[PDB]
Structure 1
Amino acid sequence: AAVELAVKYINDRHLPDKAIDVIDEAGARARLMPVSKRKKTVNVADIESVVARIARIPEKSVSQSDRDTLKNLGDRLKMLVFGQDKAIEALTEAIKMARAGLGHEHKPVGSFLFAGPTGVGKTEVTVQLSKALGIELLRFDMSEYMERHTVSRLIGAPPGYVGFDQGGLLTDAVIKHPHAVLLLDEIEKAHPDVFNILLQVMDNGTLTDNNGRKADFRNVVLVMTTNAGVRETERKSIGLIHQDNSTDAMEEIKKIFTPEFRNRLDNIIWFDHLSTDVIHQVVDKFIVELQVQLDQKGVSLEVSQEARNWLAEKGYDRAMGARPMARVIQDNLKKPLANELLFGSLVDGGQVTVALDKEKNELTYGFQS
């Protein structure tokens, strides 16, 4: 197990040295293990745990605590990301497959392209997944790579140049964090030549920096959110007789991405427009965040059900998504409380409440102490 597991996971050392240290590290761990005289023998389970620590990768045999967390991983995410259930399904299933041992031995855990209208929760599901699993999120903004030569920072500059010593960002990041989440927001904005690097990353799970070091992408989840979907949502035909437009819709992404890059994507998730019912849930999430911040100071905020329904309709936007909700929540709910909290009745406020008056057509903020 030690020899096979090391070569499978440890790629920066040779077989004799790396295998031997696993055996040595297992015995040493066993030396301090008998808190209750548990020093009988060293089994295969111990070899899997020591290797999981050397390479900073999850152990081969899923625990009973890791196992319990993956059972309700999808349900836990739905409590913060409402709608887009198929997106969570694909992510959760991929993580479960890789842990069970059915993953691809030469590819990342998952390579899912996220498209759809803006403000539908593309980066949130990715950020929430990392937080839920205790996985370091590696965020790379593809807006800083709008030129063909920007790739020098991802893998490093060649020898004999100003940036040879500094090294690459992506390669060093994955080397430091073997188990992490890779997020490339607005991938389409990046130059068409950056897609070529990702090809080997998804096909062979390996990337080589200017120093000859190989980065291991087998335990990293690659997510590339794009805004291509928003373009085809109109589904309008300039003609006397209308058309379905189903076939043409969602085909623009194939034009901007080579079929090679798409052929190795695990799945291409599509994000549907936020439903009206879902907007209410998003408001609850924002209000909850405000309440937690207020609870640190000791203030307690209560929002009437009627106010939430009107507040949601005020900021409901299909094109922009639920991004406007941040502004309306800040401008309406948060700003009145700023002056009071700093100097006023809300310094030690409790049982605060809020509501709206239909005839007035505006909010009503009340305070108590």
Structure 2
Amino acid sequence: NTPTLDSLARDLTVIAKDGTLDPVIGRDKEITRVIEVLSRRTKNNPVLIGEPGVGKTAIAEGLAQAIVNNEVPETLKDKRVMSLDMGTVGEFEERLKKVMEEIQQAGNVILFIDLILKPALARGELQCIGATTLDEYRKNIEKDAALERRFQPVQVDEPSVVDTVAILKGLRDRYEAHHRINISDEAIEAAVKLSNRYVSDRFLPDKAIDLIDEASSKVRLKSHTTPNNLKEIEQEIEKVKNEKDAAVHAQEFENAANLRDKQTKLEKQYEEAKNEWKNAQNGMSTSLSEEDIAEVIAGWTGIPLTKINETESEKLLSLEDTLHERVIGQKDAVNSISKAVRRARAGLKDPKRPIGSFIFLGPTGVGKTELARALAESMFGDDDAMIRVDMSEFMEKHAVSRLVGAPPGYVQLTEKVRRKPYSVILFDEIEKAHPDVFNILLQVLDDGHLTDTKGRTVDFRNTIIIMTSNVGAQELQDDYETIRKTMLKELKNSFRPEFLNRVDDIIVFHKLTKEELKEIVTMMVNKLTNRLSEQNINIIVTDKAKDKIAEEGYDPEYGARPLIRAIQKTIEDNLSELILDGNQIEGKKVTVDHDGKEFKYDIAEQ
């Protein structure tokens, strides 16, 4: 009976034996592993280790409901599992000691900790099920040999891609009887595809079950709107009732009969209208379309509906146009990277290894930063989803212990990539870095996944690794294929030949000509005009002024970087003064024309 154990902990098996709980499906392997570990004589107290809120606590939930159906083995049969919170517990340890004593000699009750009682677990008398993560298990359970040898290191695996589809199909009818909304077949797969792509902080299985509930509630609320048919009668009924009530207290019964008759007629008409309205709605079924989930998911991360509507069919075909729209110049280096990415998506490249692997050479500010920023927007859909990790200040011995994570005992890249696995990692100035850093980088391109000191394993499948090096820039300043071949020897001389075997292509940036800066200036002018779209301001620059301003601040060493400041100090300085002069111009079209001596800002109207 174990009366002492039941007075200090909550038995989760009794509540789950009623059959009213939801079916915890998808943990096929975890339940079998836990049963095998518990039934064995050695390491009879396995501890569940996994990520927080990814199935670490949901794995033990399904085992309690399987006791009634006798789905466990013979050794694990007729056993009750109690889930006790770690925050419950001299006076504090008395409850734990009483629970351990009443369960050590019995063996029919297994306690749980949300990893004194060390002797009970070491001898296998009492079975303990852990619920901590990998970092806690490797620091407490692995600290002592007796605790480590008596605890099976079980891992709580999360649901697979196809596991969630079956769970959603099985519980599809449950929501139809609650929200009165018919669920189609394509909605389940659309939701399970969108959750695995956009949602990355909750993982499976708790990212898909709650995704369709919001869409069903939204469509239920939208389908019950009144099309200006019921309120127009309800207001009349309310006002007639109020008028009759006012006359009742006024001792005026002459109009009371007429008011009551009118109210009865209005009630009959409202009942007929309600019946005819409810008959039409129930005729058809409100199936959940694929756009409903997209609309709900667009409001959480700001992703436009156009990006969600793409099914990875036309994105590859329009990749070159998107890349060339924001970056103008050196089309050889732009079209080269657009062909090496589509080939890897077919299956020609290992999925674990990163797909994006290119080396950028040349001075900064020529357009490399803009291309790097636009690549993430064109591929993923987010422009700010970039983790820029420089190596300028990583010249110390402890530089390798910073990006890999915080070692146990002390007070970066892994933490940032865990929350946003779909991002582009940039390593600026890779030619000047500590030698210990390259060891971590080699494993990324070779293996594909890393592991920090806390035991968490991070994946780099859908990641792009681009390293920027300054080698080869001095030779160029003193055909694209010939230049790439000539710079390949210089690149291989400086770095290790083994590290360069995982790079697909080498990108070398050339020197922009005079005719290529005019389009960049035009793009900057268009970007400036688009910013002021809320104030309805039309900005146009003539071709004569662009040529004059292009060479005003041209710098061969930097490139187009000083051009931004030149445009800001030339065009915007005069534009701001006119706006600040009591709204001199509003809803007009200002044309900037240069006569060769001074920039005459002509003021016109649209």
Structure 1: distance between partners of 2:163 and 2:483: 61
Alignment map for 1:248-287 (pairs within 5 Å): 251-287=489-525
Pick one of 156, 175, 178 that aligns with 2:405.
Answer: 156
Q: Match for 1:305: what amino acid?
A: D
Query: 2: distance between equivalents of 1:111 and 1:185?
Result: 14
2:146 alignment partner in structure 1: none
Show the 5 A alignment for 1:197-276.
197-235=440-478, 251-276=489-514
Spell out, residue by residue over 1:168-192, the C-alpha distance to the aligned partner (whole angstroms, 9 max, x if none). Answer: x211222211221112222234334
User: Aligned residue for 1:325?
Assistant: 563
- Could you tell me how far 1:90 is from its partner in structure 2? 4.1
Pair 1:323–1:107, CA change in 2 (3 A):
same
Q: Within the alignment, does 1:69 sit opposite 2:315 as a pair? A: yes
- Quote the residue 2:392 is aligned against: 143
Distance, in Å, in 2 between the alignment partners of 1:99 and 1:318 is 38
Residue type of the partner of 2:571?
A: L
| Comparing 116-125 and 106-115, the one that deviates more | 116-125
| Superposition deviation, residue 71 in structure 1 | 1.1
Asked if structure 1 preserves the Cα contact closer than 8 Å seen for 2:340 and 2:504, the reply is no
Of the structure 1 ranges 323-332 and 272-281, higher mean CA displacement relative to structure 2 is found in: 272-281
How is 1:121-200 mapped onto 2 (pairs within 5 angstroms)? 121-132=367-378, 133-135=380-382, 136-162=385-411, 169-200=412-443
User: 321-330 or 174-183: which moved more?
Assistant: 174-183
Comparing 77-86 with 30-39, greater Cα deviation is found at: 30-39
Counterpart residue number, 2:602: 366
Which secondary structure does the structure 2 equivalent of 1:364 belong to?
strand
> Are residues 210 and 233 of structure 1, via their aligned partners in 2, closer, same or farther at CA, if it must alter by over 3 Å?
same
Q: Aligned equivalents of 1:189 and 1:268: distance in 2?
A: 19
- Corresponding residue SS for 2:415: helix
Percent sequence identity over aligned pairs: 39
Structure 1 CA distance for aligned equivalents of residues 465 and 512 of structure 2:
24
Compare CA radii of gyration and give the structure with the larger one. 2
Q: 1:301 to 1:54 in 2, by over 3 A?
A: closer
Residue 199 to residue 355, structure 1, CA distance change in 2 (3 Å): same
Superposed, 1:24-63 pairs within 5 Å as 24-27=166-169, 38-39=184-185, 52=197
| 1:260 to 1:356, Cα distance in 2 relative to 1, 3 A | same
- Asked if 1:18 is matched to 2:151, the reply is no
Contact 2:200 2:420 in 1 (8 A): no
Contact 2:537 2:586 in 1 (8 A): yes
Q: In structure 2, do the counterparts of structure 1 residues 305 and 261 end up closer, same or farther at CA, with 3 Å as the change threshold?
A: same
Question: TM-score scaled to structure 2, two decimals?
Answer: 0.50
> Does the aligned pair in 2 maintain the 1:142–1:185 contact within 8 Å?
yes
Structure 1 residue 160: Cα displacement: 1.7
| 1:105 is aligned to 2:340 | no
Task: Indicate the SS of the match to 1:228.
Answer: coil
Question: Which secondary structure does the structure 1 equivalent of 2:472 belong to?
Answer: helix
Q: What code does the residue aligned with 1:366 have?
A: D
Larger relative contact order (CA 8 Å, sep ≥ 6): 1
Counterpart CA distance in 2 for 1:40 and 1:266 is 38
**Aligned-residue offset at 1:17:** 4.7
- When the two structures are aligned, how many residues end up with a matched partner? 340
| Aligned equivalent of 2:577, options 309, 327, 339 | 339
Asked whether the equivalents of residues 346 and 367 of structure 1 are also in contact (C-alpha less than 8 Å), the reply is no
Consecutive unaligned residues in structure 1, runs of 5 or more? 4-10, 163-168, 236-243
8 Å CA contact retained: 1:315, 1:322 = no
Residue 76 of structure 2 aligns with which residue?
none
Per the alignment, in what secondary structure is the counterpart of residue 367 of structure 1? strand
The alpha-carbon distance between structure 1 residues 26 and 49, as it changes in their structure 2 partners (threshold 3 A), is farther
Contact persistence 2:360–2:466 (CA under 8 A):
yes
Residue 315 of structure 1 contacts residue 328 of structure 1 at CA under 8 Å; is this kept in 2? yes
